[PDB]
Write a protein that binds this DNA or RNA. Structure first.
Ligand code: SFG
Ligand code: SFG
Ligand SMILES: OC[C@H]1O[C@@](CO)(O[C@H]2O[C@H](CO)[C@@H](O)[C@H](O)[C@H]2O)[C@@H](O)[C@@H]1O
Lengths: 249, 250
DNA sequence: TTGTATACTAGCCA
DNA sequence: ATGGCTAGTATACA
DNA sequence: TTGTATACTAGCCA
DNA sequence: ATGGCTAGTATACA
């Protein structure tokens, strides 16, 4: 197991003490949305006030671990995003609401509403001096698109010559079960977006915390990009998968 | 103007009393977001708790105007979306969060955050039997794409033959200044979006309300598709532009 | 091919 | 407890 | 070219 | 109070 990367088969809400206050530059949180999924446990079986209470509980434990320059990304569903973001705006300051456009809509069979195709990500910061580096995550143009975008007014601009801001909508397709990156986990997140977070909001060598790491996608991002990692996952199968994913680099 | 198209150059909060309760089938609300724009007035000059108080004010005026079958779309910025939606969930039930992907990001020059390219839209309903008709808003495939999506298992499915759900992310570019649609209004909304909303959530001939109609995009949307319209705008020039836009269809 | 505006600059330093 | 200066910001319409 | 799974049906009726 | 049954749900991986 590489150095700096640290995986625990433990519940975060109980081991939070083992984590020094103000030791983490970035929290990458993909917690249970409150949607009834089966992680081999009932963590995503909560809902309503129950789920939101649990959310704010683990959040109150996690926040004090952020150093003053720290930041946080938190995934959730629109069904609970208003309440969650409202609570977090009392503690931290919201820098962005990033929309993950999964490209592939949820199934079921409804015709009474619009089908789900996005997840919500709150991007919060402790203080106004939060760390943020755009250059590693700039998206470079290809020959054709740069040609289509180039104008003398824009020539030499950083966004045109180096690459543009990924913007607060990320259109990255969800991972097909047969996708090469896919592992046996119900709600695995594309490494693309997690790497974007690690790169833009964690300095090289900084420490990232994933209190609900699942298959360890954030562990992989940190390993590939030279960041330190800490992760918690109550399911040992997912934890072993994370070990595997990391050691294969 | 056509038949069921009522354009009132009146402040909505003083004139909502005139509109009968349980009169409106759909509310298409694009209120000021609280970002500091200039509509010839200080409506968007509010911010923070004072802006959220004014939002609650006009919302409390507008909700009772909904028939038990009615619905509401509300445009907002991620900056005030959590509080506004949190408050609306206590008055109505949320059916969707629609993300308008504007394709063109906001300018400025920042480097210390991700650039704004999406507006938030809350889709709420009074009761669990709200009126929703997906067929008129379905998006049919072209030939090549229908060939790429067809499979024996899918053949005959309504989504493959008639059209697929727009989903809760609508990718539609903002109206360029020189765009045909565009008029002299700072925050004009694409007719595609507004029309999708009107067609999916207002019964033909029903009444839709626009507390702040601006250029009357919703007015056009209802004129075509044959729906009734009541809109309010305090700017006489915006009301003028709306009058023109409506008296140019057919 | 190209000009150009579109709901959502910000950190210093004074 | 405010400004102003700087380096900086994409797409798609006509 | 084709099979196939993917964080988020929903109303009725025995 | 509880299944089961219905009509029904898009893309992009391999
Ligand atoms: N108290 C808890 N402590 C640690 N893990 C938990 C806890 N509660 C739920 N979990 C796990 O958190 C994970 C949430 C997942 N969304 C993580 C997915 C992860 N982003 C991935 O790419 O694989 C699940 O695997 C849960 O089993
Ligand atoms: N009390 C008020 N009553 C009526 N209109 C108002 C009021 N306050 C602000 N407005 C107007 O609300 C409008 C908000 C706009 N975003 C509407 C845009 C509109 N959807 C369009 O396509 O043009 C502005 O034009 C304001 O002039
Ligand atoms: O959490 C930041 C978030 O709050 C908003 C409105 O909800 O602004 C509020 O908080 C700001 C903190 O920087 C204050 O400056 C502002 O006065 C207050 O309204 C959003 O602007 C912002 O995204």
């Amino acid at each position: 197991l590489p150095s700096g990367i640290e995986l625990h088969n433990r519940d975060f809400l109980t081991d939070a003490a083992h984590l020094p206050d103000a030791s983490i530059d970035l929290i990458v949180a993909d917690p249970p949305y409150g949607l009834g999924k089966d992680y081999g446990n009932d963590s995503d079986k909560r809902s309503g006030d129950d789920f939101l209470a649990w959310t704010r509980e683990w959040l109150e434990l996690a926040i004090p671990k952020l150093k003053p320059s720290g930041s946080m990304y938190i995934f959730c569903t629109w069904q609970y995003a208003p309440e969650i973001f409202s609570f977090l705006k009392t503690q931290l300051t919201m820098v962005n609401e990033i929309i993950w456009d999964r490209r592939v809509p949820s199934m079921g069979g409804t015709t009474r509403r619009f089908t789900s195709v996005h997840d919500n990500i709150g991007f919060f910061a402790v203080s106004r001096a939060y760390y943020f580096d755009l250059d590693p995550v700039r998206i470079p143009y290809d020959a054709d698109t740069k040609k289509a975008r180039s104008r003398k007014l824009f020539e030499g601009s950083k966004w045109l010559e180096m690459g543009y801001n990924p913007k607060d909508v990320w259109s990255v397709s969800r991972l097909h079960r047969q996708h090469a990156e896919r592992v046996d986990h119900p709600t695995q997140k594309p490494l693309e977006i997690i790497e974007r977070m690690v790169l833009a909001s964690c300095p090289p060598g900084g420490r990232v915390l994933d209190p609900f790491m699942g298959s360890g996608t954030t562990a992989v991002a940190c390993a590939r990009q030279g960041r330190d990692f800490v992760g918690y996952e109550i399911n040992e199968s997912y934890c072993a998968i994370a070990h595997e994913r990391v050691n294969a680099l």
